[PDB]
Design a protein around this ligand. Structure first.
Ligand SMILES: [K+]
Ligand SMILES: [K+]
Ligand SMILES: [Mg+2]
Ligand SMILES: [Mg+2]
Ligand SMILES: [Mg+2]
Ligand SMILES: [Mg+2]
Ligand SMILES: [Mg+2]
Ligand SMILES: [Mg+2]
Ligand SMILES: [Mg+2]
Ligand SMILES: [Mg+2]
Ligand SMILES: [Mg+2]
Ligand SMILES: [Mg+2]
Ligand SMILES: [Mg+2]
Ligand SMILES: [Mg+2]
Ligand SMILES: [Mg+2]
Ligand SMILES: [Mg+2]
Ligand SMILES: [Mg+2]
Ligand SMILES: [Mg+2]
Ligand SMILES: [Mg+2]
Ligand SMILES: [Mg+2]
Ligand SMILES: [Mg+2]
Ligand SMILES: [Mg+2]
Ligand SMILES: [Mg+2]
Ligand SMILES: [Mg+2]
Ligand SMILES: [Mg+2]
Lengths: 108, 95, 76, 353, 46, 37, 47
RNA sequence: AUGUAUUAAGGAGAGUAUAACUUAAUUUAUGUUUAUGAUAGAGGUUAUCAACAUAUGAACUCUUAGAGAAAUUACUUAAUAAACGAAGUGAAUUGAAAUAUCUUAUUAACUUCAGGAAAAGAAAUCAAACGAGAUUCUAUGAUUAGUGUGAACGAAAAUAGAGCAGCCUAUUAAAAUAAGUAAAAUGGCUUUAAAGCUGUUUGAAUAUUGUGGGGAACCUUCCUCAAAGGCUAAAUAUAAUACAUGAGUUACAGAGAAAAGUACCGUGAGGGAAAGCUUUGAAAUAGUAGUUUU
């Protein structure tokens, strides 16, 4: 999906006023409250919504498709059947389910 | 100048012309002398009837279970003007 | 008119507001009227004054204990 | 009027939006206060479970020096004596979530369609007193709990002092309540192959044949066992005794009819209608014909104002505006089937040949 | 250093200088109310 | 047509405990060994 | 509470009659059996 | 966070059955289905043991007649936030390793006007000797042509996709086809010198039977269009609501706010918290105990 999002110091709420005077306080100088060093500051290199998709040549993707079929074929894990592939459920149950005699609980 | 100043000003907090009534209603007019003349056309009276011999009370015995009215096939059952008129002709036609 | 104390909407939380004021009126009657005297604590049993007095005492102790704590103190 | 209806619909939406914002906030304040009150019962059960871990080990090590804990002072963390519960925890008076209520009666229908009633014999399937069969005495639908007045279900409880004299004992034994999910119905069913009656445990119940009565706001239904489809009759319940008090009106005076409609005079003094509804409210939908007429006039005056410059038109401007009325009246010429045919000959000749 | 500038202050000046009417009836006052209304303030004036 | 599956039959009414007059029938005191349906 | 509910019903039935009566008058203006002009005998049972 | 759908004025004060919301603060009715539902009892305060759909009573005060120190006065069937849009006005920080042109930037901001969108719009448009065929949004074309001393700024044709709609008889009521206009000089804007906007002073022509505009100094031929009159939905912007999705968050995270623009600070504009649950209990730190040393 690639939709994660975090706020930087340029998107965190609040005013961009200078917190403390540049000097005279004896404490470490500070700028805005939205700095990453501050409690509720913004994550500098945080996640942003972007596209995580990559490219793959149509010919390489087609070779990987037949390579997966060949892996199953050479191992006996590829079973090809005739068209009309469906589970042969009993005709009695199929007749009840359509009729509505069977409840959802029993039908499932 | 602190928290109390931020509360809404009331007549019990200040003087010097701060008048604020309580929505009692104008019962007259002011004069130029600083007095008040009451206008009895604005004064209100309470019409309470005679309750002697009145058998109804604000309660009904719980032996009579609550029941709502039924108006089958009538969307505006109790608000039907036709039912009010039809019920008027039969009961009271004079007035 | 009797004013009501300014309070917070939720007691200890919320904005500060003030409930509506109370108005009392004293009428000068043409015929006197005298109120009965309140029943004695021994005759208030029709109101379950015994159970009500026990609950009241417990509530008074609870508010007194909170007041001691509000002073930053504890009962030794 | 169309413009007056939009005025009411808009106002109805503003007040509805304001109420939802306040209700949403109030629901969260009460849910936080209630969850915090229920936490006091969780904390107690957790403290007692850890104390039993300390007591079992102490008894194993000391042996002949095992302390007499039943003679010790109360635990100030909760105020309970030894081996004694709290009234809130023995009666299960804690208000639970609406999702929990639906789960406590999942086996006997829904909270609002309940197929278990007082007077039914149930069997416990949880706790220490499992397989215990008893009769229901009362049923609390707020927490979905049930009381079974069985001697084995009694448990010590610490009585608060605000409801106890100085001469009474602090601890007492009371019947403990159970949730409806911890019990199942016990009913005798006739064995069809043998022909004798034996008690069976009903794992599930569901409502059936539901019919409401809107005039009385009543409801009557039946309960059955799914799978086997065995309708189980309801237990014999005694209706509440309704009495006539002295402060109530006599039936003869309640049923007395005294209202006769009128047509030439209002049902009550016209001045009363001003006390029933607000004459100047923005929610008023029934207006007088003069008021609606005046509203329509204002819109007609605005119209005439936009059309006032027509008197300042030059003769050429009037000539062109008149020709449109005539041109627009001519209409659009129609293609006769005779001409449509001659057109098709050109289409086919230039398309096929 | 700070000074006791609220000494002898009256509440008639607060209403005149920061009251509601002082703002709805002016061009710049309307902006103040609209700014505080957008922020969600309950106390729009005084 | 009759099917090979058994479905829940039509509903039946169970006699109330007050109406059961079977002599050899005593209520159960414990739910140990009782059938569950 | 019960006294307040009784007062609420009184205000509901009175407001219901006022609107039901205001509408019946209009409905009667178009009724051939009723003649609102003459008040001494405004109703005549239709044949 | 994005997407989809729907909608197109917002808040406050006080009061009230503390799930129930407006002094009526739990109104009164209709239809259908009700366990094969929907997605043969008890129970009117020991209440609301019924959901859906359609109606319905009530709905206070201020913002919001006048006035005033908003929630008052005095009257009365008095009533419209923000964001987004267009035009007008229009910086500076910054970069050029200084700095004036330039850049920042037809930016921020302010004012006016307007609607649910607005604006724009059916060629006096582009192309190049072949042809395309209104407007709007996105991408490519394009760190291109080109401009600039530099730093940097920067198109169009065309292509692809979203939408697609043409007209004047405009599906709302408008033109007798546009003269102080086109254009020139001069002072500016824009900009590549053209085209386009504009103050001052001047000032044309009448249609392919070649009249007028444009095709990037300028002239000419040819091509192309037809100004000085107008109408037009959709794709677009913003806000609210609902839903869907998640190698998004899980309580110093997410949002500023899991009870918030509240508490609190400030004369004011304005600034702006902490705080989840019944689980787990790390380190630091404190008082002891055991072994050992002093
Ligand atoms: K700054
Ligand atoms: K030229
Ligand atoms: Mg954060
Ligand atoms: Mg005072
Ligand atoms: Mg004073
Ligand atoms: Mg004065
Ligand atoms: Mg019944
Ligand atoms: Mg009222
Ligand atoms: Mg209404
Ligand atoms: Mg100073
Ligand atoms: Mg002074
Ligand atoms: Mg005003
Ligand atoms: Mg007013
Ligand atoms: Mg340089
Ligand atoms: Mg270049
Ligand atoms: Mg022309
Ligand atoms: Mg020009
Ligand atoms: Mg030029
Ligand atoms: Mg030109
Ligand atoms: Mg050229
Ligand atoms: Mg034209
Ligand atoms: Mg936080
Ligand atoms: Mg955690
Ligand atoms: Mg953390
Ligand atoms: Mg630790």
């Amino acid at each position: 999906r690639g939709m994660a999002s975090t706020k930087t110091r340029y998107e965190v709420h609040g005013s961009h006023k200078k917190m403390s005077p540049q000097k005279g306080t004896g404490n470490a100088r500070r700028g805005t409250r939205q700095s990453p060093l501050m409690k509720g500051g913004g994550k500098t290199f945080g996640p942003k919504p972007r596209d995580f998709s990559t490219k793959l040549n149509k010919k390489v993707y087609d070779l990987a498709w037949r390579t997966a079929l060949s892996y199953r074929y050479k191992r006996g894990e590829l079973i090809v059947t005739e068209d009309g592939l469906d589970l042969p459920l009993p005709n009695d149950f199929l007749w009840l389910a359509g009729g509505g005699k069977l409840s959802r609980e029993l039908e499932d | 100048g602190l928290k109390y100043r931020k509360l809404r000003l009331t007549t019990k907090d200040v003087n010097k012309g701060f008048y604020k009534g309580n929505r009692t209603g104008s019962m007259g007019t002011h004069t130029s002398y600083g007095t008040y003349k009451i206008d009895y056309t604005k004064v209100r009276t309470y019409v309470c009837p005679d309750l002697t011999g009145f058998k109804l009370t604000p309660f009904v015995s719980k032996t009579i279970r609550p029941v709502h009215d039924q108006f089958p096939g009538d969307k505006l059952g109790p608000k039907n003007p036709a039912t009010y008129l039809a019920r008027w002709k039969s009961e009271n036609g004079l007035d | 008119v009797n004013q009501r104390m300014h309070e917070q909407r939720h007691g200890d939380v919320g904005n500060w507001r003030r409930p509506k004021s109370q108005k009392m009126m004293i009428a000068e009657l043409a015929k006197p009227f005298v109120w009965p005297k309140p029943p004695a604590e021994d005759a208030r049993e029709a109101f379950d004054y015994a159970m009500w007095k026990k609950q009241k005492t417990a509530q008074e102790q609870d508010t007194k204990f909170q007041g001691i704590r509000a002073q930053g103190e504890v009962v030794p | 009027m169309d413009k007056l209806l939009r005025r009411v619909r808009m106002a109805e939406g503003m007040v509805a939006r304001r109420a939802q914002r306040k209700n949403a906030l109030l629901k969260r304040i009460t849910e936080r206060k209630q969850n915090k009150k229920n936490g006091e019962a969780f904390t107690e059960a957790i403290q007692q479970r850890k104390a039993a871990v300390e007591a079992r080990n102490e008894d194993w090590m000391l042996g002949p020096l095992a302390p007499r804990r039943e003679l010790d002072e109360i635990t100030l963390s909760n105020g309970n004596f030894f081996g004694s519960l709290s009234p809130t925890r023995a009666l299960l008076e804690s208000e639970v979530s609406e999702e929990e209520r639906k789960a406590r009666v999942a086996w006997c229908g829904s909270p609002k369609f309940l197929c278990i009633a007082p007077g039914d014999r149930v069997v416990v399937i949880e706790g220490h007193h499992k397989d215990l069969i008893g009769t229901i005495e009362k049923l609390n639908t707020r927490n979905m709990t049930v009381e079974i007045q069985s001697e084995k279900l009694k448990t010590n409880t610490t009585v608060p002092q605000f409801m106890q004299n100085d001469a009474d004992k602090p601890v007492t034994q009371i019947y403990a309540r159970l949730p409806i999910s911890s019990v199942r119905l016990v009913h005798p069913l006739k064995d069809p192959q043998t022909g004798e009656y034996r008690d069976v445990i009903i794992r599930e119940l569901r409502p059936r044949n539901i019919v409401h009565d809107r005039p009385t706001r009543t409801r009557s239904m039946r309960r059955f066992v799914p799978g086997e489809n065995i309708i189980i009759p309801w237990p014999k319940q005694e209706p509440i005794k309704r009495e006539d008090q002295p402060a109530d009106t006599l039936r003869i005076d309640v049923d007395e009819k005294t209202f006769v409609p009128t047509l030439f005079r209002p049902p009550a003094p016209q001045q009363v209608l001003d006390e029933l509804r607000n004459k100047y409210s923005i929610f008023r939908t029934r207006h007088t014909p003069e008021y609606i007429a005046k509203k329509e006039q204002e819109e007609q005056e605005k119209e005439a104002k936009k059309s006032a410059a027509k008197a300042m038109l030059t003769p050429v401007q009037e000539y062109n505006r008149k020709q449109r009325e005539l041109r627009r009246a001519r209409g659009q010429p129609a293609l006769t089937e005779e001409m449509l045919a001659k057109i098709g000959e050109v289409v086919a000749r230039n398309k096929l040949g | 250093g700070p000074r006791p500038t609220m000494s002898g202050a009256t509440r008639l000046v607060q209403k005149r200088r920061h009251g509601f009417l002082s703002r709805v009836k002016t061009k710049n006052g309307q902006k103040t109310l609209k700014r505080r209304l957008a922020k969600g303030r309950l106390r729009l004036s005084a | 047509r009759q099917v090979n599956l058994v479905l829940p039959g039509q509903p039946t009414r169970a006699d109330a405990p007050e109406k059961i007059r079977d002599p050899n029938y005593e209520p159960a005191t414990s739910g140990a060994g009782l059938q569950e349906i | 509470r019960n006294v307040k509910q009784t007062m609420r019903g009184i205000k509901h039935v009175l407001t219901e009659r006022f609107y039901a009566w205001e509408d019946a008058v209009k409905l009667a203006e178009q009724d051939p059996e009723i003649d609102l002009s003459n008040p001494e005998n405004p109703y005549t049972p239709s044949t």
